[PDB]
Design an enzyme around this catalytic site. Structure first.
Site, short mmCIF file in Angstrom:
data_model
loop_
_atom_site.label_atom_id
_atom_site.label_comp_id
_atom_site.label_asym_id
_atom_site.label_seq_id
_atom_site.Cartn_x
_atom_site.Cartn_y
_atom_site.Cartn_z
N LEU A 36 0.84 -1.18 0.00
CA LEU A 36 0.00 0.00 0.00
C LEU A 36 0.88 1.24 0.00
O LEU A 36 1.97 1.23 0.59
CB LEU A 36 -0.92 0.02 1.23
CG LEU A 36 -1.68 -1.26 1.59
CD1 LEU A 36 -2.23 -1.17 3.00
CD2 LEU A 36 -2.76 -1.55 0.57
N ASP A 37 0.42 2.29 -0.69
CA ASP A 37 0.98 3.63 -0.55
C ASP A 37 0.22 4.37 0.56
O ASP A 37 -0.61 3.79 1.26
CB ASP A 37 1.01 4.32 -1.94
CG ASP A 37 -0.33 4.97 -2.38
OD1 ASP A 37 -1.33 5.08 -1.64
OD2 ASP A 37 -0.36 5.42 -3.55
N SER A 38 0.51 5.66 0.75
CA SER A 38 -0.13 6.38 1.84
C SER A 38 -1.62 6.58 1.58
O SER A 38 -2.40 6.66 2.54
CB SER A 38 0.56 7.72 2.07
OG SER A 38 0.47 8.57 0.93
#
Ligand code: NDP
Lengths: 81, 185, 177, 123, 89, 355
Positions: A36-38
């Site tokens: 996941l990214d932010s």
């Protein structure tokens, strides 16, 4: 405890972006697993709070950065523990 | 021609049964209040049938005119949830509903008689067979009707009940104020 | 014996030039004339559409030019109305509201465009915040010219609209159909 | 005093990227939580996931913008749009401006190579 | 004597076996009072007496005041709770 | 900028010897050069068709009989694009006028029922012959008939019999005619499908709800007619626009009931009684089911496999179970919210009664 992680790990793999279909575990980082990214880290806490029929605050929806923090926050019994 | 108006009372009985079942079964309560209004109308009809149209009109201008206006005035403003009539929830009462129906009806009918044997007390209630003669006399001189008689006795013989109903109505004023109106100042 | 021929006439005149000659024709003409009499003598627009240039429309409600003498009544609500009067500028922030009010009206329904700013955008035709014609949204039956059109122009436009509905075929067309 | 409307935030220009990061993330979170409301209030003909997809696309649009003042401007504009959408100010048209894709395929020939553009004089 | 007993019994049964709401309870009370008045007025006619009609008019007064007080009490409940749910009193 | 999504080029040339240069980007002001003619634009399908044609500047000639049904078409284009004529199949000059200056012609004529002035024959056969003879006299380059699905020259249904005779006459006078054969169309304000299942108090089937068919969204058929009007490869051809998924009547009704959250009412009374009740309802002036349509309730869709399809036009036709939500949400009653529990404690914090 099993009442939560069961639906948690459900909505994590329901999140298609995870390059691993089958690498969800407790002590799986939302970030340094690179699943996941932010932004997705917020999309997931979103899908979780609405899965369990709740709405998390801002400061603590920031603090929720891994599976352990999520299960431990649903543990507070807002609703649908 | 004659007997076209013979069974009007039985018709009203059947219709009151229907309106009761409909009050009990309706989904939205507003409809149940409308059926209650139908029932008060049927009662007013029956009272006209037996010779008391004055009470028919007093009912239509009291119950329907105020009480039911108010019932709609409440359910229009409150969030009165419901649970539509079902089979999982209310079927369990059928044996008790039936036992209660039979016993309460037969008792409410036996109660009105003074015979000593039980079964005859009900067979007396079911003896509605004979006609009542109406003779004409010439002793009543005035134009006194039921409302005039009620005024005479209520304001002379039973004055105390009137002067107590005034206090019942004072409660009707003063309690609802105390409950609704918060005298914070 | 299934049909397999047709006596279909040629040279059947078109509705504009179709004169009556049968008792059914005179009857349907009378019913149409009465329905159109009704539609004419009671001509109720809706209060919507009167944004800009409402002064000249209010002057048609005034004494010197009474619209009520023709049976005109302005109504708050579409559902009781038949006519819409798109006066004033029809802006892009407003067109959806206009189409809602127009779809809410019960048929039969007409439209009459009062002013230049509503016919072709007029003065603000080249602006960013304008619909260059109310045609783009709704179908228009009569176009009143002017900016602001004179009260007399509005009355004359209503007298053209009454003519349109008076030469309308409600039942005669069904007797054609 | 003229008081602020419902979801109004006071315009405040952050001096750092590290705070605006947090503010943008809260905005994204609010959009996502409110997407079902954006589907109910506007009579929508598609999915809540598709709304969330479009939201992610709109936030990926300006993901690579490093000038701080421009980011503050973008965040303020986005909060304006959230206030416009969640309060039922926008109507259906102004909202489905953001969803051209969901509408039916516009015709057949959508040129993507040179020769078709030349035959249509678009090159 | 019949119609009144029937409305009374059916309304008592619908008061007792109401798992749904409360307005049915109010209604069943009012219908019970109606059926009483019909019983009594039938007897007052057959006896050609007035005490029955006196008690009837008195019942009408008292029932209307009953509904007034009951519908202030309900409003108090609603003040505090905001919703009158199906199985709350 | 806008696009000419319908055209592949800007300079087109008809088979009648006219050159048609496009102008613009393809918006309201643009012009495609073309001039068409649509004989039923007042109706359900032709309305969507004129909308798609006149969105790009194609001049549209629209014959009408009722002046008031049509007005909703003038919106569809700029000034001078949509042009109206009063016409009747019992007047020939009117038809020559409508088709004279046209490069394209489109016949959408046909009632699902009979009348006093028009039987199924007169409107599906003779009207097609009149239009064809005028399309031939003036040598219009293109002709695009639409003849109903399941059409067969001799069949229990008189409708399908005429529709089959209208096919062979058109194609035996106008050899270059294109023929389309749409299956039961559905959409917003449809005739006899979803507005009926959503509004009609009770359905009836002389069979069971068993007649099998492939339905299709009407916008896609309009896209098809657009992609045929301009493609000259489709002369002397035939199409079967049916749709990917086979649906029995009872299946459609169950999806309609699920989406509506209301129990649609179906009866299933036998044939002769329904056929009689329909026959007696044909004397009132408003359209209703007619004796020949309960006859079609026993005739499922036989698809001709020798004819072209959607995939011959680069189209991806849509599915009923997806679109039923968009089409039936207006009749959705949406009674109230689910499961009000776990809200008393939240409601208890708010002030419900002011003083
Ligand atoms: N819709 C469907 O489900 C299917 C449609 N079709 C065919 O496709 C076409 C679609 O029509 P539809 O979309 O059903 O909507 P309509 O059938 O209502 O379209 C009917 C059109 O034909 C015109 N028309 C009918 N009879 C006459 C006549 N006697 N003289 C002149 N004009 C006439 C009507 O004009 P006005 O409206 O002015 O009276 C109307 O514009 C028809 O040919 C139909 O047979 C085939 C299979 C299924």
């Amino acid at each position: 405890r099993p009442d939560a992680e069961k639906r948690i790990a459900a909505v994590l793999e329901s999140f298609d972006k995870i390059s691993n279909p089958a690498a969800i575990t407790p002590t799986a980082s939302f970030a340094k697993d690179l699943n996941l990214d932010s932004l997705d880290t917020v999309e997931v806490v979103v899908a979780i709070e609405e899965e369990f029929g709740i709405e998390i605050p801002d400061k603590e929806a920031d603090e929720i950065k891994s599976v352990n923090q999520a299960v431990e926050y649903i543990l507070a019994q807002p609703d649908a523990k | 021609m004659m007997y076209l108006t013979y069974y009007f009372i039985e018709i009203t009985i059947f219709l009151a049964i229907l309106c009761t079942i409909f009050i009990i079964s309706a989904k939205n309560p507003m409809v149940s209040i409308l059926y209650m209004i139908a029932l008060f109308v049927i009662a007013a009809m029956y009272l006209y049938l037996i010779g008391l149209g004055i009470f028919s009109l007093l009912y239509i201008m009291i119950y329907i005119g105020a009480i039911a206006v108010l019932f709609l005035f409440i359910i229009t403003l409150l969030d009165i949830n419901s649970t539509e009539l079902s089979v999982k929830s209310n079927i369990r009462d059928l044996p008790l509903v039936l036992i209660s129906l039979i016993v309460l009806t037969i008792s409410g009918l036996m109660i009105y008689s003074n015979d000593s044997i039980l079964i005859n007390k009900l067979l007396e209630a079911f003896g509605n067979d004979y006609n009542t003669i109406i003779t004409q006399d010439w002793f009543n001189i005035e134009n006194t009707t039921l409302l005039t008689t009620i005024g005479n006795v209520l304001l002379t013989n039973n004055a105390f009940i009137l002067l107590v109903l005034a206090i019942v109505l004072l409660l009707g004023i003063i309690g609802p104020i105390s409950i609704t109106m918060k005298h914070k100042e | 014996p299934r049909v397999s021929s047709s006596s279909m006439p040629t040279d059947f005149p078109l509705p504009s030039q179709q004169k009556p000659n049968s008792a059914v024709d005179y009857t349907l003409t009378t019913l149409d004339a009465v329905a159109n009499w009704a539609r004419q003598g009671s001509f109720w627009p809706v209060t919507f559409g009167l944004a800009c240039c409402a002064v000249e429309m209010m002057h048609v409600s005034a004494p010197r030019y009474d619209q009520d003498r023709l049976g005109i009544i302005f109504r708050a609500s579409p559902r009781q109305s038949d006519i819409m009067i798109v006066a004033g500028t029809l802006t892009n922030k407003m067109a959806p509201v206009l189409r809602q009010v127009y779809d809410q009206m019960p048929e039969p329904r007409w439209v009459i465009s009062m002013g230049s700013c509503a016919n072709g955008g007029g003065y603000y035709h080249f602006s960013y915040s304008v619909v260059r014609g109310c045609d783009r949204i709704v179908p228009v039956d009569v176009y009143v010219p002017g900016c602001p059109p004179t009260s007399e122009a509005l009355m004359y436009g209503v007298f053209q609209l009454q003519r349109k509905m008076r030469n309308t075929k409600i039942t005669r067309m069904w007797y054609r159909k | 005093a003229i008081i602020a409307t419902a979801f109004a935030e006071t315009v405040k220009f952050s001096g750092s990227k590290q705070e605006l990061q947090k503010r943008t993330l809260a905005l994204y979170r609010q959009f996502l939580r409110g997407a079902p409301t954006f589907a109910d209030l506007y009579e929508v003909q598609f999915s809540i996931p598709t709304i969330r997809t479009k939201i992610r696309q709109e936030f990926e649009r300006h993901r690579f913008v490093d000038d701080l003042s421009i980011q503050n401007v973008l965040y303020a504009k986005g909060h304006m749009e959230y206030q416009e959408c969640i309060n039922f100010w926008k109507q259906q048209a102004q909202f489905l401006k953001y969803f051209p894709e969901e509408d039916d395929i516009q015709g057949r020939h959508q040129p993507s190579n040179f020769v078709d553009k030349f035959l249509k004089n678009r090159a | 004597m019949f119609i009144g007993t029937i409305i009374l019994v059916l309304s008592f049964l619908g008061f007792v076996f109401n798992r749904r709401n409360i307005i049915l309870a109010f209604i069943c009370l009012e219908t019970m009072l109606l059926g009483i008045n019909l019983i009594l007025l039938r007897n007052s006619v057959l006896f050609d007496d007035i005490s029955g009609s006196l008690f009837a008019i008195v019942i009408i007064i008292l029932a209307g005041v009953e509904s007034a007080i009951g519908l202030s009490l309900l409003v108090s409940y609603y003040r505090l709770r905001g919703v009158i749910n199906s199985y709350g009193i | 900028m806008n696009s000419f999504e319908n055209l592949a080029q800007d300079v087109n040339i008809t088979r009648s010897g006219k050159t048609l240069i496009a102008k613009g980007t393809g918006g309201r002001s643009s012009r495609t050069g073309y001039t068409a003619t649509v004989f039923g634009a007042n109706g359900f399908l032709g309305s969507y068709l004129t909308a798609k044609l006149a969105k790009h500047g194609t001049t549209v000639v629209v014959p009408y009989r009722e002046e008031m049904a049509k007005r909703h078409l003038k919106v569809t284009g700029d000034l001078g694009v949509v042009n109206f004529l009063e016409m009747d199949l019992r007047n020939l000059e009117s038809i020559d006028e409508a088709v004279r200056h046209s490069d394209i012609v489109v016949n959408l004529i046909g009632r699902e029922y009979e009348t006093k002035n028009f039987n199924y024959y007169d409107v599906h056969v003779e009207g097609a012959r009149r239009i064809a003879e005028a399309v031939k006299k003036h040598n219009i380059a293109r002709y695009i008939h639409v003849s109903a699905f399941n059409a067969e020259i001799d069949s229990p249904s008189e409708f399908n019999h005429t529709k089959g005779l209208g096919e062979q006459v058109t194609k035996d006078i106008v050899p270059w005619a294109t023929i389309v054969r749409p299956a039961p169309m559905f959409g917003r304000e449809d005739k006899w499908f979803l507005d009926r299942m959503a509004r009609s108090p009770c359905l009836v089937s002389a069979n069971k709800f068993q007649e099998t068919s492939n339905p299709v969204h009407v916008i896609d058929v309009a896209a098809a007619l657009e992609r045929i009007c301009f493609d000259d490869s489709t002369v002397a051809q035939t199409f079967e626009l049916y749709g990917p998924q086979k649906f029995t009547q009872k299946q459609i009704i169950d999806m309609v009931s699920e989406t509506l959250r209301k129990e649609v009412r179906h009866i299933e009374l036998p044939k002769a009684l329904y056929q009689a009740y329909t026959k007696a309802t044909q004397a009132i002036w408003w359209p209703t089911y007619s004796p020949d349509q309960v006859e079609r309730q026993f005739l499922s869709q036989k698809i001709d496999p020798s004819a072209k399809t959607f995939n011959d036009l680069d189209l991806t036709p849509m599915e009923l179970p997806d679109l039923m939500f968009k089409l039936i949400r207006p009749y959705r009653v949406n009674t109230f919210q689910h499961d009000v529990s776990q809200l008393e404690n939240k409601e208890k914090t708010f002030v419900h009664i002011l003083d």
